[PDB]
């Protein structure tokens, strides 16, 4: 019945309107207060502005550069090696599934749980702990 159903208690609220009456609580000012900047149309203090003291983001030094070398990096957890088909974890095989982005060339494998099955990594270079898991739990690490 469309004459019956309604939502859960608390799921909908009713958008309090400032500027109506005196019993509603928000009458005659709307929760703003009295005279000043944050009481007027467009009383927006600029984000980061302090009042005239030298702000934080103009007192501290600039401290680095950005590596364009690591715009091509990704990494795969050991637990996600069971999420591919064919048991040949190539470079394009991880792009066949949605486990990795496009335009990604160099991939590692680190230790983040149990592997799951018997695969053959090639084209990708695992860490010290991941290589001690795959070569021990029935896999093979070739190129």
């Amino acid at each position: 019945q469309l004459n019956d159903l309604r939502s859960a208690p608390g799921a909908r609220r009713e958008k309090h309107r400032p500027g109506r009456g005196i019993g509603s609580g928000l009458g005659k000012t709307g929760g703003r207060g009295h005279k000043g900047l944050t009481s007027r149309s467009g009383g927006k203090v600029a984000p980061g502005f302090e009042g005239g003291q030298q702000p934080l983001h103009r007192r501290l030094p600039k401290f680095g550069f950005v590596s364009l070398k690591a715009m091509d990096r990704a990494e795969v957890r050991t637990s996600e090696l069971a999420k591919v088909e064919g048991d040949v974890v190539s470079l394009q095989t991880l792009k066949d599934a949605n486990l990795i982005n496009q335009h990604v060339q160099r991939v590692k494998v680190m230790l983040s749980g149990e592997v799951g099955r018997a695969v053959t990594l090639k084209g990708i270079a695992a860490t010290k702990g991941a290589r001690a898991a795959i070569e021990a739990a029935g896999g093979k690490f070739e190129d």
Binding site: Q1, L2, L5, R6, S7, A8, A11
Partner: protein, 199 residues
Amino acid sequence: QLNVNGAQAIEVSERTFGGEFNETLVHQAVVAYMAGGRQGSKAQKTRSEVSGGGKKPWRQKGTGRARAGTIRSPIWRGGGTTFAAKPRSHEQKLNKKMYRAALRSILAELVRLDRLVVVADFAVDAPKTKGLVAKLDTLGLKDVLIVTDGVDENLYLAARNLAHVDVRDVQGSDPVSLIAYDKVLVTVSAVKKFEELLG
């Protein structure tokens, strides 16, 4: 199970039919469908499109009247509306998994409340409205929703002029009409169609 009128059970999947009736979900699914059909065509007019009203009607001081700046202001008589609204869309995003759980929740209470009549096959022969009226007199129904696998050209030309009888498809049904009409009439071709569509 779903007792077809030719007296044979069918043993449907018990995840679609016979489920818990969450109605916070169904209320949200019928609001998003019913609001998504509204075309939004308003146009009021702000103080910048009302024709004229460029210059001050008198000086700043010395006149006695209150400080006015233009004629086409929201306080004045011929002025413009102060929060005039351009046309816009009304469309909520409902998830694909969330649209389907409202279907598996309203297709359970139609089974409990016995609004659902499953038939062997429903087929008319010539497009003529008085032939279909006599066909629905066999089942004893009135103001019914006809859900079938494919809307036949003979069946679609009938029940356009007919008053309270509507004909749909499984991929043309919606969470309003399954709640709206008095009785829902499905065929055995269509109850299998809700298996791969819902679960």
